[PDB]
Coordinates of C-alpha atoms and ligand atoms in Angstrom, one line a residue:
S12 CA 89.3 96.6 101.7
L13 CA 85.5 96.3 102.2
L14 CA 86.0 94.3 105.4
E15 CA 87.6 97.4 107.0
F16 CA 85.2 100.0 105.8
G17 CA 82.3 97.8 106.5
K18 CA 83.8 97.4 110.4
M19 CA 84.6 101.3 110.2
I20 CA 81.1 101.9 109.2
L21 CA 79.3 99.7 112.0
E22 CA 81.6 101.5 114.6
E23 CA 81.0 105.1 113.3
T24 CA 77.3 105.0 113.0
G25 CA 76.1 101.7 114.4
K26 CA 74.3 100.2 111.0
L27 CA 75.3 97.4 109.3
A28 CA 76.9 98.6 106.0
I29 CA 75.1 96.2 104.3
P30 CA 72.2 96.4 104.3
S31 CA 72.3 99.9 105.5
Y32 CA 74.3 101.7 103.3
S33 CA 74.6 99.1 100.3
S34 CA 72.2 100.5 98.0
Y35 CA 71.3 103.8 99.6
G36 CA 70.4 106.4 96.9
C37 CA 72.3 107.4 93.5
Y38 CA 75.6 106.5 95.3
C39 CA 76.1 103.9 98.1
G40 CA 77.1 100.7 96.5
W41 CA 76.8 100.1 93.1
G42 CA 78.6 103.2 91.0
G43 CA 76.9 106.3 90.4
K44 CA 75.1 107.8 87.9
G45 CA 72.7 110.8 88.8
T46 CA 72.2 113.5 91.3
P47 CA 72.8 112.5 95.0
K48 CA 69.5 112.3 96.8
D49 CA 70.8 113.9 100.1
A50 CA 74.2 114.3 102.5
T51 CA 74.3 110.3 103.0
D52 CA 74.4 110.0 99.4
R53 CA 76.7 112.8 98.8
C54 CA 79.0 110.6 101.7
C55 CA 79.1 107.7 98.6
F56 CA 79.7 109.7 96.3
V57 CA 82.4 111.8 97.4
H58 CA 83.7 108.3 98.2
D59 CA 83.5 107.1 94.7
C60 CA 85.6 109.9 94.0
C61 CA 88.1 109.4 96.2
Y62 CA 88.6 105.9 94.8
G63 CA 88.2 107.6 91.7
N64 CA 91.5 109.3 92.2
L65 CA 93.5 106.2 93.0
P66 CA 93.7 104.0 89.5
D67 CA 96.3 101.7 90.0
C68 CA 94.9 100.7 93.7
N69 CA 92.4 98.4 94.6
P70 CA 90.1 99.7 97.4
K71 CA 87.8 96.7 97.3
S72 CA 90.0 93.9 98.2
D73 CA 93.4 95.6 99.3
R74 CA 93.3 95.5 103.7
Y75 CA 94.7 98.4 105.7
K76 CA 95.1 98.9 109.3
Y77 CA 93.7 101.5 111.7
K78 CA 93.1 102.0 115.3
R79 CA 91.0 104.1 117.8
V80 CA 92.3 106.6 119.7
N81 CA 90.0 107.8 121.6
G82 CA 87.2 107.7 119.0
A83 CA 89.2 108.9 116.3
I84 CA 90.4 107.0 113.4
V85 CA 94.0 107.0 112.7
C86 CA 94.6 105.0 109.6
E87 CA 98.0 103.4 110.3
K88 CA 101.2 102.9 107.6
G89 CA 101.0 100.4 105.0
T90 CA 101.9 100.9 101.2
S91 CA 100.7 103.5 99.3
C92 CA 97.9 102.4 98.3
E93 CA 96.7 101.3 101.5
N94 CA 97.0 104.4 103.5
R95 CA 95.3 106.6 100.5
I96 CA 92.6 103.8 100.6
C97 CA 92.1 104.4 104.9
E98 CA 91.6 108.1 104.3
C99 CA 88.7 107.4 101.5
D100 CA 87.2 105.4 103.9
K101 CA 87.5 107.6 106.9
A102 CA 86.6 110.4 105.4
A103 CA 83.4 108.8 104.3
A104 CA 82.2 107.2 107.9
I105 CA 82.5 110.3 109.5
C106 CA 80.6 111.5 106.3
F107 CA 78.6 109.2 107.7
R108 CA 78.0 110.0 111.0
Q109 CA 77.8 113.5 110.4
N110 CA 74.5 113.2 108.7
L111 CA 73.0 109.8 110.7
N112 CA 70.0 112.4 111.4
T113 CA 68.4 112.6 108.3
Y114 CA 69.8 109.3 106.9
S115 CA 66.1 108.2 105.3
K116 CA 65.1 105.1 104.9
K117 CA 62.6 105.9 101.6
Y118 CA 66.5 105.9 99.7
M119 CA 66.5 102.7 100.5
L120 CA 67.0 100.1 97.4
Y121 CA 66.2 103.2 95.7
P122 CA 65.7 102.7 91.9
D123 CA 68.2 103.2 88.9
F124 CA 65.9 105.5 86.6
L125 CA 65.0 108.0 89.4
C126 CA 68.8 108.8 89.5
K127 CA 69.1 111.4 86.4
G128 CA 71.6 114.3 86.0
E129 CA 75.6 115.0 85.6
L130 CA 77.6 115.5 89.0
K131 CA 81.1 115.8 87.5
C132 CA 83.8 114.9 90.3
Ligands
IOP21 O1 80.9 95.4 96.0 C1 80.4 97.0 96.7 O2 80.6 97.5 95.5 C2 79.2 96.8 97.5 C3 79.5 95.7 98.8 C4 79.8 96.2 100.2 C5 80.5 95.7 100.7 N1 80.9 96.4 101.9 C6 80.0 97.7 101.9 C7 80.2 99.0 102.6 C8 79.3 100.1 102.1 C9 79.0 100.0 100.7 C10 78.9 98.9 100.3 C11 79.8 97.7 100.8

């Protein structure tokens, strides 16, 4: 659920999910359309696509368990939806960490009309 995902993001990047990643670019937050603005926005796009492969799961509210093995994120065994949701979130948190150097505040609160284009998962 968003509770685990937010904690994962803070641990990984030092930034608070909200406000740092809830209104960033075209895909971090709201849903999504257009071309990702940058690497961090692409992390969100892929994350949305990852959730997209789990039609009968509920990523935002279904809670899962995960632990840290010397920094490494390890998803603990739960239901099948929980396992897959955790893997999607783990991937995004790492992607965010990997692109911290290019994170740009000019993409915070990015306006909707500037998200033009096509990008299928
Ligand atoms: O409801 C969600 O779509 C947006 C609010 C939200 C809570 N925790 C988050 C962690 C990362 C990105 C967005 C969020």
